[PDB]
Amino acid sequence: SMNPPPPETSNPNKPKRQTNQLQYLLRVVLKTLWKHQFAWPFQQPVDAVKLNLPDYYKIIKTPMDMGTIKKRLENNYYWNAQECIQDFNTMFTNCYIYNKPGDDIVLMAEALEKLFLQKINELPTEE
Ligand SMILES: O=C1CN(C(=O)c2cncc(-c3ccccc3)c2)c2ccccc2N1
Ligand code: NA
């Protein structure tokens, strides 16, 4: 069994910026989700070998996880906040697509997503 290479977290080719919104995404949004009791399954790429999920990467072709997002934010990978918001949403969507409603992992994603929406609602206007 084999995992795919993880999503990139640096690309010197890719233009990048710091914005007030990106700083909020790290200091408030990622911080908040990372420390939550339900964060752990989402803190690194899904390890389909260890978890014995050989179909995971046959189903999920756009993987994303908070370990990747954390590294992207700490490296200033992004140009804008919407790229990073999209990453979070990809992560949640992957969980909902792969798993059944009401599975514990889905409950975990839902709790994290509730907090994500709460924080995103007060994203600052750009400086
Ligand atoms: O989307 C996924 C990927 N996944 C995990 O990432 C994962 C990794 N660590 C822990 C959990 C987890 C935590 C509590 C309850 C059930 C699963 C899940 C997982 C593992 C096993 C069975 C189903 C899934 N579904
Ligand atoms: Na599903």
Side-chain angles (χ1 to χ4, degrees), residues 89 112-122:
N89 279 317
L112 299 173
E113 186 182 21
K114 182 168 169 185
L115 287 166
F116 172 79
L117 288 165
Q118 180 190 123
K119 305 307 179 180
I120 291 302
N121 182 61
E122 296 196 13

Coordinates of all heavy atoms in Angstrom, one line a residue, residues 89 112-122:
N89 N -12.1 24.3 3.1 CA -13.3 23.8 2.5 C -13.1 22.5 1.8 O -13.9 21.5 1.9 CB -14.1 24.8 1.7 CG -14.9 25.7 2.6 OD1 -15.5 25.3 3.5 ND2 -14.9 27.0 2.3
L112 N -15.5 21.2 13.7 CA -14.5 22.1 13.3 C -15.0 23.1 12.3 O -14.7 24.3 12.3 CB -13.3 21.3 12.7 CG -12.6 20.4 13.6 CD1 -11.6 19.5 12.9 CD2 -12.0 21.1 14.8
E113 N -15.9 22.7 11.4 CA -16.4 23.6 10.3 C -17.3 24.6 11.0 O -17.3 25.8 10.5 CB -17.2 22.8 9.3 CG -17.6 23.6 8.1 CD -18.4 22.8 7.1 OE1 -19.0 21.8 7.3 OE2 -18.6 23.4 5.9
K114 N -18.1 24.3 12.0 CA -18.9 25.3 12.7 C -18.0 26.4 13.2 O -18.3 27.6 13.0 CB -19.7 24.6 13.8 CG -20.6 25.6 14.5 CD -21.6 24.9 15.4 CE -22.3 25.9 16.3 NZ -23.2 25.3 17.3
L115 N -16.9 26.1 13.8 CA -16.0 27.1 14.3 C -15.3 27.9 13.2 O -15.2 29.1 13.3 CB -14.9 26.4 15.2 CG -15.4 26.0 16.5 CD1 -14.5 25.1 17.2 CD2 -15.7 27.2 17.4
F116 N -15.0 27.2 12.1 CA -14.4 27.8 10.9 C -15.4 28.9 10.4 O -14.9 30.0 10.2 CB -14.1 26.7 9.9 CG -13.7 27.3 8.5 CD1 -12.5 27.7 8.3 CD2 -14.6 27.3 7.5 CE1 -12.1 28.2 7.1 CE2 -14.2 27.7 6.3 CZ -13.0 28.2 6.1
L117 N -16.6 28.5 10.2 CA -17.6 29.5 9.7 C -17.7 30.7 10.6 O -17.9 31.8 10.2 CB -18.9 28.8 9.5 CG -18.9 27.8 8.3 CD1 -20.1 26.9 8.4 CD2 -18.9 28.5 7.0
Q118 N -17.8 30.4 11.9 CA -17.9 31.5 12.9 C -16.7 32.5 12.8 O -16.9 33.7 12.7 CB -17.9 30.9 14.4 CG -18.0 31.9 15.6 CD -17.8 31.1 16.9 OE1 -16.9 31.5 17.7 NE2 -18.5 30.0 17.2
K119 N -15.5 32.0 12.7 CA -14.4 32.8 12.5 C -14.3 33.5 11.2 O -14.0 34.7 11.1 CB -13.1 32.1 12.8 CG -12.9 31.4 14.1 CD -13.2 32.3 15.3 CE -13.1 31.5 16.6 NZ -13.4 32.3 17.8
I120 N -14.7 32.8 10.1 CA -14.6 33.4 8.7 C -15.6 34.5 8.6 O -15.4 35.5 7.9 CB -14.8 32.3 7.6 CG1 -13.6 31.4 7.6 CG2 -15.1 32.9 6.3 CD1 -12.3 32.2 7.3
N121 N -16.7 34.4 9.3 CA -17.7 35.4 9.3 C -17.2 36.8 9.7 O -17.7 37.8 9.3 CB -18.9 35.0 10.3 CG -20.0 36.0 10.3 OD1 -20.6 36.2 9.2 ND2 -20.3 36.6 11.5
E122 N -16.2 36.8 10.5 CA -15.5 38.1 11.0 C -14.1 38.2 10.4 O -13.3 38.9 11.0 CB -15.6 38.2 12.4 CG -17.1 38.3 12.8 CD -17.4 38.7 14.1 OE1 -16.6 39.3 14.8 OE2 -18.7 38.7 14.5

